[PDB]
């Protein structure tokens, strides 16, 4: 019972085991998402047409003479592709059921709660042409970080 | 606050209350919430004893409301948005109430029946001011950050 | 090299002596100017003529 300095590090190493660097960035976006945003659309969901909750959808791509295949960055990027996913808000006009209509697209931030990676093990990051050191924090809109 | 022109007058304090329009002495706004009668208004600012010094400064402040003088006029002296409109009273009154529920200290509460809450804050605000002109503390530090 | 930066061991004892021996010179100021026995002047003020 006294406590030595070499111990303090053995504590603050734990902090970087879980919290990691850039943790909040990166987290101030991991919460958007769902999140506080489904209530902000309800502050003005009126029109002499009502806005509902919004289905969460993973980042995909749709193109002519092609099909609906999700994105797999960074195998994207170079296709100068913007890395977003579609928003779908239930609209109310009355036929009991809503409408699930698409409302523009929102650019996702790499390595998030709702990203294409999140819980992916190191050995599996390579397969995808990624780098276990990347710590997210950025967007790849129009092909560039 | 003002305190210049040794000729005009006795160091009198005002307010702005965004986003329109000019300067509006303090008593005018207490009288626009639910506290028109004097004395009670000072209770929200200072607390006797008292300590007249900190209060005294009110003299010039109240004088600005020597015409208010109730609830009608108060809301009246608020016709200046703006882009040329109104006509005139009734309408003006409505705008005043709207302001008190969105503009006048927009946080706290934006409901309807909560004008007695925003009545103290102003007293609290101006409580601070008095502490500085009388030289009782020091102007907060914008350095923070903190 | 560093050696050119490391003052004599003996003669370094006498360094640390004349530094900690100037604490006592503040002690006789931090507490002696709490008994209003400065004093100050000129240029002012009293808190400043202490800092000085």
């Amino acid at each position: 019972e006294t406590l030595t300095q070499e111990d303090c590090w053995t504590v603050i190493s734990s902090f970087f085991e879980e919290t990691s660097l850039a943790r909040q960035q990166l987290f101030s976006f991991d919460e958007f998402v769902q999140n506080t945003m489904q209530e902000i659309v309800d502050d003005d969901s009126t029109l002499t047409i009502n806005f509902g909750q919004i289905y969460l959808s993973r980042p995909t791509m749709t193109e002519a003479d092609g099909s609906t295949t999700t994105m797999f960055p960074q195998e994207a990027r170079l296709r100068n592709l913007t890395y977003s996913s579609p928003l779908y808000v239930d609209m109310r006009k009355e036929d009991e059921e809503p409408s699930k209509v698409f409302i523009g697209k929102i650019p996702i931030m790499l390595r998030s709660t709702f990203c294409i990676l999140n819980g992916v093990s190191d050995s599996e990051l390579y397969d995808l042409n990624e780098c276990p050191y990347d710590q997210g924090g950025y967007f790849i809109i129009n092909g560039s970080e | 606050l003002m305190a210049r022109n040794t000729e005009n007058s006795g160091q009198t304090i005002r307010a702005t209350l965004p986003y329109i329009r000019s300067d509006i002495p303090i008593v005018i706004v207490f009288r626009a919430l639910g506290v028109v009668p004097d004395r009670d208004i000072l209770e929200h600012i200072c607390y006797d004893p008292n300590d007249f010094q900190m209060l005294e400064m009110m003299k010039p402040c109240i004088e600005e409301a020597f015409v208010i003088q109730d609830k009608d006029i108060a809301l009246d002296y608020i016709g200046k948005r703006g882009s040329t409109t109104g006509v005139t009273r009734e309408k003006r009154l409505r705008y005043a109430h709207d302001i008190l529920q969105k503009e006048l200290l927009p946080h706290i509460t934006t409901m309807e029946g909560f004008e007695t809450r925003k009545a103290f804050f102003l007293g609290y605000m101006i409580h601070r001011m008095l502490l500085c002109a009388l030289e009782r503390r020091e102007p907060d530090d914008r350095d923070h950050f903190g | 090299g560093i050696g050119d930066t490391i003052a004599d061991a003996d003669t370094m004892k006498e360094v640390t002596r004349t530094v900690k021996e100037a604490r006592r010179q503040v002690a006789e100021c931090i507490q002696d100017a709490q008994h209003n026995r400065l004093k100050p002047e000129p240029g002012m003020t009293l808190r400043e003529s202490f800092e000085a």
């Binding site: - | 350095d143 | 930066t5 640390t16 900690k20 604490r23 931090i30």
Partner: protein, 52 residues
């Protein structure tokens, strides 16, 4: 070390930093190192130096 003609300024509150009492008008805290770039500088000091 200095700053605008006055040893390390106070604020926040009535203190140089949160590793000190209040009204600590002593060098052992307010910008003032005792060691050189050899030992050399102590945390509670290192910062004072960087901000000067």
């Amino acid at each position: 070390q200095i700053v605008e003609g006055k040893r390390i300024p106070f604020g926040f509150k009535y203190r140089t930093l949160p590793h000190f009492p209040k009204d600590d008008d002593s060098p052992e805290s307010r910008g003032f190192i005792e060691n050189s770039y050899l030992r050399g500088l102590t945390p509670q000091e290192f910062f004072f130096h960087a901000m000067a």
